[PDB]
Swiss-Prot record:
Changing residue 114 to N: Loss of GTP-binding activity. One of its GO terms (biological process) is negative regulation of neuron apoptotic process. It is found in: Cell membrane; Golgi apparatus; Golgi apparatus membrane. Involved in the activation of Ras protein signal transduction. Ras proteins bind GDP/GTP and possess intrinsic GTPase activity. It comes from Homo sapiens (Human). Alternates between an inactive form bound to GDP and an active form bound to GTP. Activated by a guanine nucleotide-exchange factor (GEF) and inactivated by a GTPase-activating protein (GAP). This is GTPase HRas. The lineage of its organism: Eukaryota, Metazoa, Chordata, Craniata, Vertebrata. Keywords: Acetylation, Cell membrane, Cytoplasm, Disease variant, Glycoprotein, Golgi apparatus, GTP-binding, Hydrolase, Isopeptide bond, Lipoprotein, Membrane, Methylation, Nucleotide-binding, Nucleus, Palmitate, Prenylation, Proto-oncogene, S-nitrosylation, Ubl conjugation. GTP binds at residues 13-18, 29-35, 59-60, 111-114, 140-142. It comes from the Eukaryota. In its GTP-bound form interacts with PLCE1. Interacts with TBC1D10C. Interacts with RGL3. Interacts with HSPD1. Found in a complex with at least BRAF, HRAS, MAP2K1, MAPK3 and RGS14. Interacts (active GTP-bound form) with RGS14 (via RBD 1 domain). Forms a signaling complex with RASGRP1 and DGKZ. Interacts with RASSF5. Interacts with PDE6D. Interacts with IKZF3. Interacts with RACK1. Interacts with PIK3CG; the interaction is required for membrane recruitment and beta-gamma G protein dimer-dependent activation of the PI3K gamma complex PIK3CG:PIK3R6. Interacts with RAPGEF2.
Length: 161
C-alpha cells in the first residue's frame, strides 16, 4: 500500500514519543523514557485511503541518515519551553540542508497545550509557521487533543506536495 515516511523531530523532552505513542497505542502515561530511535508502522485509513504510516520517533539530544529518508516532518516544540521553540529554526534548517529542498512537507507542532503555564504564545508560533509556509497545530499528548490532526495534516501535506 501507499507508505508515508514520517519523522518526528524537536528538542529533548517536548513530547515526540508521547505524541507517537498516543497516535499508535491510543494512550499517554506520564513517564520518563528518552528515545534513541524507534519505529512504528501502522496500517491506517486516512480520508478513505488505506496507508502505512512508517513513523520514526527520533532523539532530541547522526540525524542526516533519518532525515534524508524522510517524506514529511513533524517539528515539535513545547508551549512551556521557549528554548524548544527557539530550537525549531535549527531543525528546519537541518532538514532543508539534508533534503536539499525549500519546501518539504512539514508541520509545526506546539505540544503540551494541556499545561496551564504557557511561555510560548500561539500567535508567536503561528507567525513563525506562516513565515515557513507550513501549518501550525497545537497538541496534547496527554489529552490527545490535536494529535490525529497533527499527523493526518502532515500526511495531507505529503499528498499535496
Ligand atoms: N502535560 C503533558 N506532558 C507531556 C506531554 N507530552 C509529553 N509530556 C511529558 O513530557 C516528558 C517528555 O516526553 P517525551 O515524549 O519522552 O519527550 P521526547 O521529546 O520524546 N523526549 P526524547 O527526545 O528524549 O525522546 C514526559 O514526562 C512526558 O510524559 C503533553 O502533551 N502534556
Ligand atoms: Ca545539502
Ligand atoms: Mg521520545
Amino acid at each position: 500500500m501507499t507508505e508515508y515516511k514520517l519523522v518526528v523531530v524537536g528538542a529533548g523532552g517536548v513530547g515526540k514519543s508521547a505524541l507517537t505513542i498516543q497516535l499508535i497505542q491510543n494512550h499517554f502515561v506520564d513517564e520518563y523514557d528518552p528515545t534513541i530511535e524507534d519505529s512504528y508502522r501502522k496500517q491506517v485509513v486516512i480520508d478513505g485511503e488505506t496507508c502505512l504510516l512508517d513513523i520514526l520517533d527520533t532523539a532530541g539530544q547522526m540525524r542526516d541518515q533519518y532525515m534524508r529518508t524522510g517524506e514529511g516532518f513533524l517539528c515539535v516544540f513545547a508551549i512551556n519551553n521557549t528554548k524548544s521553540f527557539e530550537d525549531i529554526h535549527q531543525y528546519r534548517e537541518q532538514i532543508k540542508r539534508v533534503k536539499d529542498s525549500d519546501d518539504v512537507p512539514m508541520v509545526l507542532v506546539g505540544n503540551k497545550c494541556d499545561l496551564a503555564a504557557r511561555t510560548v504564545e500561539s500567535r508567536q508560533a503561528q507567525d513563525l509557521a506562516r513565515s515557513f509556509g507550513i501549518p501550525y497545530i497545537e497538541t496534547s499528548a496527554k489529552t490527545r487533543q490535536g494529535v490525529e490532526d497533527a499527523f493526518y495534516t502532515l500526511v495531507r501535506e505529503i499528498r499535496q506536495h
